[model samples]
Target: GPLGSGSKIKLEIYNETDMASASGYTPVPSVSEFQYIETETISNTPSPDLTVMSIDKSVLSPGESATITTIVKDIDGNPVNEVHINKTVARENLKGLWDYGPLKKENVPGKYTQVITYRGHSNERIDISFKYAMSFTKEISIRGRL
Candidate 1:
């Protein structure tokens, strides 16, 4: 789908099931289909340079914890304030909830850091935003399960 700049995308899925359950000795065939329920795109795009940068640790050891940081900057290479940071974890069969953080009051020049802790199993994803100024997103994966 083509989206205009600064537009948000919305998606919905609809499923159709036409199948029967087998009971006793009879066999049953089931069919399913998916349809797009709804979609919308937003306007008023933000500039590319106004984004977050990832400071992730490449590897971690079992039982040990590591911190990953990210910086948010504007098109002019200035530190952004009032930015929101969101973090999440992904596993083999589950998608974790998002955790959020607002930029600190001490707004200084350059990128800001948001540290993430890895417990040696699940992969971690981070997203940061400075409202209309810019936003950044990135993820890191842990190779093996603990």
Candidate 2:
């Protein structure tokens, strides 16, 4: 099998030369029914899947900070911001429905929250602009159950 992700693209073995004359044991080249077109593909870009790069800590004291990053691509699996711990959502939008810390509550005993959000796309030219304010609540807590 190839050494990476996805369903391992397996075909055959390393050699099937019918080595009756090679005179060897287990580790040497042997023959399958029909095997080894060549070898595993060591140089494929590999399938793109969702990835949560990291969350600095699963638990934190009050007034502390934790960094979060994700490389979400797989639409079927847990894509970006798909809640590896809690307080996760897709990168397509930013919302304030999430809160996290050592203590959890809406009334805020020691909440250390700083939101980062930007809405737009960029091009090769580096000139970017965005101006608006939008807000909506989905009335969904399905994010908490997952």
Candidate 3:
């Protein structure tokens, strides 16, 4: 799961609706066309130490409350110990929460925020998926520019 521990996993996938899903996996299954899909598979490879982390933002507004916060470091900044946050919101109401962990316990700081409202506009995009820590990068289908 951690690319076999010791850290080193770089996956940048463009799920062109599943162009053989790039690096590959039925990984997110039992469904399709969205309807909840989350997959992580690492069967081999490891040992490379840790260094190189970045994902920060603040420019999402569509009714005001919008936030994007993720911090994981060690390359020269700070903050790195536990960072894993999974949040998925693909539509109108379910009260949020599809996945969340690398929990960082008691102080859960690699934050998570959501306050969005968009019920059919002219242009729309709210495809959310994130798993940051051992790497699963799409920076999570984020498109904010209301």
Candidate 4:
């Protein structure tokens, strides 16, 4: 067989009769039955889809505040709880526009709502990469008066 193409089987007694001893009667024979079991391939884990990626404000100033919210749902339309999120907030350095040095990784393990805040930098970009059944990324920007 090929990948995930394994076999399944089932067996059973179609008919049977008890042996004769004290009854002084003739014994009867037994008959057997069998079948090939049915099998299907499906993922055990939930398939994640980024339903919402929203920010409270698109632009921010010095000493300002903002919020970023993300929603994750499965293919069956159920909220996905417990997902690993990599959230980064920093300037678009000359080295790379999306180079935030490294990921501040954590597990925002919850149901549908993953939120972060900023009272914080320069003309910066925010990056949010997360995973449930697979990987995903969502980004936005807050400009500085440079």
Rank candidates, lDDT, best first.
4, 1, 3, 2
| lDDT of model 4 at position 142 | 42
Writing each residue's lDDT as its tens digit, candidate 4 over 58-89 gives 65445444444556555565554445556545
Which structure is stronger by TM-score: 2 or 4?
4
Per-residue lDDT, model 1, residue 77, is 47
**Model 2: residues with Cα > 4 Å off, grouped in runs:** 1-50, 74-146
Candidate order by TM-score, highest to lowest? 4, 1, 3, 2
Model 4: which residue pairs collide?
A: 82-110
Clashing pairs counted in every model = 4, 0, 0, 1
Per-residue lDDT of model 3, residues 35-133, tens digit only: 211123223222113323223443344444344444444443334445445555564443332222332333432233434333223243455555554
lDDT score of residue 95 within candidate 3: 36
lDDT of 2 by residue, 52-137 (tens): 33333333223333333333223343222212123433333233223333212222211212222222222111111111112111
lDDT of 1: 0.43
lDDT of each: 0.43, 0.28, 0.40, 0.46
Per-residue C-alpha lDDT of model 1 across residues 15-68, encoded as one tens digit per residue: 655566876675678878863311321233333355555445554445544444
How close is every model to the real structure, measured as TM-score? 0.38, 0.19, 0.20, 0.41
- Model 1: what TM-score? 0.38
Candidate 3: clashing pairs of residues: none
CA error at residue 39 for candidate 1, angstroms: 41
lDDT of 3 at 89: 52
